[PDB]
Each structure stands twice: as structure tokens, then as C-alpha cells.
Amino acid sequence: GSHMMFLVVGQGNPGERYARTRHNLGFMVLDRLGLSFRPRGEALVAEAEGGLFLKPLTYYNLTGRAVAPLARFYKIPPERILVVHDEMDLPLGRIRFKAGGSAAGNRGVLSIEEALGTRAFHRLRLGIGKPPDPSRGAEYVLSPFREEELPVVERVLEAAKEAVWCWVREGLPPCAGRFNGLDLS
Amino acid sequence: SHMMFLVVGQGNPGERYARTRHNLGFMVLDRLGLSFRPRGEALVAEAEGGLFLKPLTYYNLTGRAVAPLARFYKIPPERILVVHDEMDLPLGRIRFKAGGSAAGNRGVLSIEEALGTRAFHRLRLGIGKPPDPSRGAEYVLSPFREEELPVVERVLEAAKEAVWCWVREGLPPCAGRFNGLDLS
Amino acid sequence: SHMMFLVVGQGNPGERYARTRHNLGFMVLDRLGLSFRPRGEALVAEAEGGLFLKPLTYYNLTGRAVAPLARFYKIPPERILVVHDEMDLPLGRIRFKAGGSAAGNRGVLSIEEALGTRAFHRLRLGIGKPPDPSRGAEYVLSPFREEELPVVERVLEAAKEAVWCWVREGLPPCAGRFNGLDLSL
Ligand SMILES: Nc1ncnc2c1ncn2[C@@H]1O[C@H](COP(=O)(O)O)[C@@H](O)[C@H]1O
Ligand SMILES: Nc1ncnc2c1ncn2[C@@H]1O[C@H](COP(=O)(O)O)[C@@H](O)[C@H]1O
């Protein structure tokens, strides 16, 4: 039988309340992949291309609970885990791959770091911009996008879908080389 | 099993030619971050659902490496981009062109002959004109001068971006963004 | 230049770091007897068809020197050896390791992140750890204690031998000759 070779994890929160918030951009990418998600453990899980795509149902800062058991079961190394998430440290229109390093305060990234015991999983950072002050971060990410931002969101979603498949096929450095410098604004 | 596009770099194979002007197209493909290996009469890399070619045919016979793949995969000419040195543009200029004449470029002519159409796209990378117009073959088979190397570096970084632009967005948006640049 | 391998010594540049525990990798590279010169953000030497590097990046940034070089020369990660001090082994231990976690070593993390893989080789030179982990930065940026220095000499000699071994035979054969040593005995 086959054995799953990679995890692609979309960050978000469960339920209709949160489906259109900036903090669900990772779920919005996973829903653009043409996949068949089904319930498994504490997530919605799709298989494609010999690995797993998941939208955890844990809430955003508890996704590590859903990712780490799957990684351990399948012996999937951090470089074959890609966490797709919104990023306040980049403007909307910018996308960046990153292997490891800081979480920049993103508590979903931190959840997965604690659960795995390593920071060195891969990330696809989807810029959403930042409020005028950092003390407004929770409110900013749990808001929807402004209507005027929607056309850019659509371009980013499309780019991100391409990026995900790039990474699955090629790993991080090649994909970073062609996607990091895009300005979708 | 389905390939959506071909990007073809012009050049001659071998270390002897790797730094020559007529290898500008190879040099751009070598900046894209891909993994090339031998495949037919070419070094080929796969990325983004298409193929990138550095032919092994020599410059003037590149069509022979392009056409089997275009035929097999049913790639229309508008999804083939030929990246090549252009003596009719100065060093520092880059221009997208859809279709049209080969303008004496024997590699471009080889591709037109092999595909049976001019409709394919080109990324023309200016290299300037030799002083003596009878020394054009020798000019393209020489290295860039020391003092041109900084401009070459800018044009390679730009052309790298331009190729990816074309892959994602097609030619009009990218001609919009690049054709006006002057990196000299 | 076709380059068959990269051997990287972890350290920081400058006199004030030269004798610190975190400079064991530089100390091994200086034991090789080679002629290093500046090249990019590194001191570089050539021998046996490959490259030997003391990056000038600082310890936690060495991936920025290593990864572009490896990509330029198409060097697979298993032909990259990183020589470094290791708090998770006692002084006197010398262990080759393929892949695995960085164990918190921020220089090994730099390389893993920049390469986008764990798959490079390491020559782990034990230095022990402080009794409280909250003074780890001071511990690594300290010289060895007086009584430690004779041990360090045995470890540097063995590590020079081990680098030459690995250049020729790579990791398993050389692990078979070095990994059971305890030079504190
Ligand atoms: N770089 C970031 N990208 C996305 N979400 C973030 C980032 N930094 C902070 N957050 C979220 O913003 C909220 C405010 O976090 P804090 O800044 O620690 O007050 C929390 O829900 C974080 O998970
Ligand atoms: N296993 C290790 N070997 C060597 N240096 C380490 C190791 N773990 C942590 N360090 C360094 O120790 C310092 C303290 O690390 P930490 O306690 O994580 O931030 C930093 O400079 C780390 O890079």
C-alpha cells in the first residue's frame, strides 16, 4: 500500500463564522486545490499526489494537535510539511516561502512548532498587511477582507494554489526563486 | 503527461561557448533556479507544468529539438517562448514579441521552419551591434567585455523575472512591464 | 570548477571569538593546513576537488554562504559536511550524523533552513551544556576551561582526521572509525 509522503496544512478556524476572515486565507487556498476533503481525526483531510492536505478543525492556535500525530505516524520530516498561512508581516499581494525560522508572532505557526518539536517545517506565507498598530492584530486577522482588497485576494489565491503544487513537486528553494518576488497588487 | 508550454533558450552547447554573447538565452535559463538534465537533443527542466530547453543541437538547429515536444504535447505556438540575443537592440533592452520575422537570427529561423509558423513568442535580449557589420559572427561568439558585465547582470535578473511573468500571465501583460525598461 | 563537496566550519569571525567553544568548527578547518582566501561572505580553500569554508556571516547566518554555493555547483546535501560544536554531547565525543534535528543549534538550523533540507552531514564535536539552559549563549561564546583544553586538542586532532576520512569515504565508513571514541578518557 502507499504511505503518505508530505502534509500540506491550511491554517484557519472552523465554522462559518470564520470562513471569510483574513486568518482563514490558508483554508481558502486549500479549497481552491480541487480536492475531496473528508473528516479524519481533528481535521478535514484530502489525499492527492501521494500526500495529505488538511484543514484542522482545532482552531488556529491548536493546529499542532492535528499535524504532529500525522507527521509521526507517517514519518514525514519537517521539510515535507508545508503550512499555508496568512502573514501580517507581508503586504497583501506578496507571498513568500520560508523554511523554518521565526513565527513573527503567528500563533498557528507556534502551535505547530511546539507540537512537532521543531520550527524547521516549511511555510507558504500569504501577506495580508498589518493594522496601524500591533496591539490590533487579533481584531485585524479575525476581520474579513475589505471589499477593495477582494480582487487582490483572488490573484493571491490563484498564485498560492500554483505555489503549493510547486512545493509538492520541487521542494522549497526552486519555488521560492519564482514566487517570492511576485507582486500580485 | 501534459505540458502546457515550452521555454527555449538559444545558445551553443559546451564550455567553450558558455560565456559568449550568443549564449545569453542559456544564461537566462540558468538563472531560473531549475534542475536541467539531458533529454533528447537538449538539456531540459520541468517547472510549472511546462518544459525549459537548452538545446544540444547548436544554435542554428534548435528547431529540431523544439518541434518533437511541441508536436507530442500539442503546444500551440503562442505557448512557446524563444529567449535569445538580439543584435538589433542595445545591451540593456529587452523586448517581448509575438510573431513576426526572424530578422536574420538563424536560431529563430530554425524554430519557425520546424514549427511551420512564425506565431511563437520571443524574448529578445539586446546585445548591441558590432563596429564592423562583417564581424557579426565573431561578435556573438565572443564574451561580453568587462565593462558590459554589470549591465549583463541586470538584464539576466530582469529576464528571469520576465520569463516567469510570461509563464503565468502571457505576453501582453509582460510586454507592458518589461519592454520599456532600460537597464544600461 | 566542478566541486565535488563542501566542508563547512561553524564559527564567528573575529579575534574575540577565535577561542570560544562556538569556534570549534573554525579550529578544525584551520587544522587542515589549507590556504583560505576571501570569497563572497566566506574564507574558502580548495583541496581534493571540493571546497572548504569558514563563513564570515556569523554563526547563525552560515546558511546564506553555504546554500548558494551548493546550488551553484550542484552539490547534493550528502556531500555537505558541517563541522560544529554540539551542546547535546559531552566534551570528548565526536559523532558523525546524517540529517536529523539541529538540537537547537542555530547555525545548523541556518543551514537546514537555507538548503531547505536536513539531509546534509554533520561532524558533531561535543562541548557539554551549562547547568541551566538560560545561560547557553554565554556558555558557547566562552573559552574552554583550563582543564578542558587538553581534551579539546585530542578532539581537534581526531576531527581533522575525520574530515579527511569523510572527504574520501563519506559518512558511514568514517562513523565506523570515529563515533565510538571518547577523547575525555
Ligand atoms: N505575523 C503574524 N501573522 C498572522 N497572525 C499573526 C501574526 N502575529 C500575530 N498574529 C496573530 O495576531 C494576534 C495578536 O497577537 P499578539 O501580537 O501577540 O497580540 C494573535 O491571534 C496572533 O496569532
Ligand atoms: N545543541 C546545540 N549545540 C550548540 N549550540 C547550541 C545548541 N543548542 C543551542 N545552541 C546555542 O546556544 C544558545 C542558546 O540557545 P537557546 O538556549 O535556544 O536560544 C544559542 O546561541 C544557540 O544557537
Numbering used by the authors:
A (entry chain B): -3 to 181
B (entry chain C): -2 to 181
C (entry chain A): -2 to 182
Pull verbatim passages from the article behind this deposition.
Pth releases the tRNA from the peptidyl-tRNA, by cleaving the ester bond between the C-terminal end of the peptide and the 2′- or 3′-hydroxyl group of the adenosine at the 3′-end of the tRNA (A76), and makes the free tRNA available for further rounds of protein synthesis.
To elucidate the binding mode of the peptidyl-A76 moiety of the substrate, we first determined the structure of TtPth in a complex with AMP by X-ray crystallography. The structure of TtPth⋅AMP revealed that AMP is bound to an acidic pocket at the bottom of the active site cleft (A−C). In this pocket, TtPth interacts with AMP via 9 amino acid residues (His19, Asp82, Glu83, Met84, Ala100, Gly101, Asn102, Arg103, and Ala134). Furthermore, the N6 atom of adenine forms hydrogen bonds with the side chain carboxyl oxygen of Glu83 and the main chain carbonyl oxygen of Ala100, and the N1 atom of adenine forms a hydrogen bond with the main chain amide nitrogen of Met84. In addition, the hydroxyl O2′ atom of the ribose hydrogen bonds with the main chain amide nitrogen of Arg103. These results indicate that TtPth interacts primarily with the adenine and ribose moieties of AMP, while the phosphate moiety is minimally engaged by TtPth. Likewise, the distances between the gate loop (Asn102) and the lid loop (Val137) in TtPth⋅AMP and apo TtPth are 10.39 Å and 11.03 Å, respectively. These results indicate that AMP binding does not change the structure appreciably. In this research, the structure of the TtPth⋅AMP complex revealed that the adenine ring of the A76-mimicking AMP binds to the acidic pocket in the active site cleft.
